[PDB]
Ligand binder design. Structure first.
Ligand code: HEM
Length: 185
């Protein structure tokens, strides 16, 4: 398929508050390229800096099988609030499962962020082809419902919040310790 290209980065985006090393949980998401196979997973990420690099680690959990997978990337700023990341898939300890490779990368845009919440758009590419295309509502607390400010950002992006899938009743489990330690790997 083709990923959405036009996402606007938050005006006055504050990169220090966003990239502070702490965890963002995905509370709600809108996947524009869902698999045919019914999938309902949980995800979280942490973005910060390590040894002078911008780093992002990712965590995905499947409550039906208890399967988990992790990724870590160095990020490169394309413009204020827009980033590219060449990811590698890892075990929770950093051991590499799938190396960084050319056409494996995602780009993302921070459309809205404040101290507690954010709306991001991501385009996922594997071996030089547009795979996933996805908006995510994030919060710093896993039990928190999307507040008025973020729902406002969803509206401003010409999206319908009712289209999003909630992770709230999904029996999610998180591994924050590993996400945070992956930042240095
Ligand atoms: C925070 C924004 C997101 C980013 C930056 C992101 C990034 C990624 C990356 C880099 C991969 C490739 C993993 C690898 O093969 O090493 C991936 C795959 C995947 N992600 Fe996300 N993701 C995001 C949101 C989500 C959400 C909200 C969900 C579900 C709740 C999700 C579920 C999945 C699934 C099921 C795959 C596997 C695709 C496959 O193996 O064919 N992602 N994502």
């Amino acid at each position: 398929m083709k990923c959405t290209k036009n996402a606007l980065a938050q005006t006055g985006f504050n990169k220090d508050k966003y990239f502070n090393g702490d965890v963002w949980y995905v509370t709600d998401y809108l996947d524009l390229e869902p698999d045919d196979v019914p999938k309902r997973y949980c995800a979280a990420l942490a973005a910060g800096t390590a040894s002078g690099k911008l780093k992002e680690a990712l965590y995905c959990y499947d409550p039906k099988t208890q399967d988990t997978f992790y990724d870590v990337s160095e990020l490169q700023e394309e413009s204020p609030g827009k980033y590219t990341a060449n990811f590698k898939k890892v075990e929770k300890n950093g051991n590499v499962k799938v190396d960084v490779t050319s056409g494996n990368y995602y780009t993302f845009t921070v459309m809205y962020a404040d101290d507690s919440s954010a709306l991001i758009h991501t385009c996922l590419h594997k071996g030089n082809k547009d795979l996933g295309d996805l908006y995510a509502v994030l919060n710093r607390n896993k039990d928190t419902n999307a507040g008025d400010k973020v729902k406002g950002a969803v509206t401003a992006a010409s999206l319908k919040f009712s289209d999003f899938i909630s992770t709230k009743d999904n029996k999610c489990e998180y591994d924050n310790v590993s996400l945070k330690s992956l930042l240095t790997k």
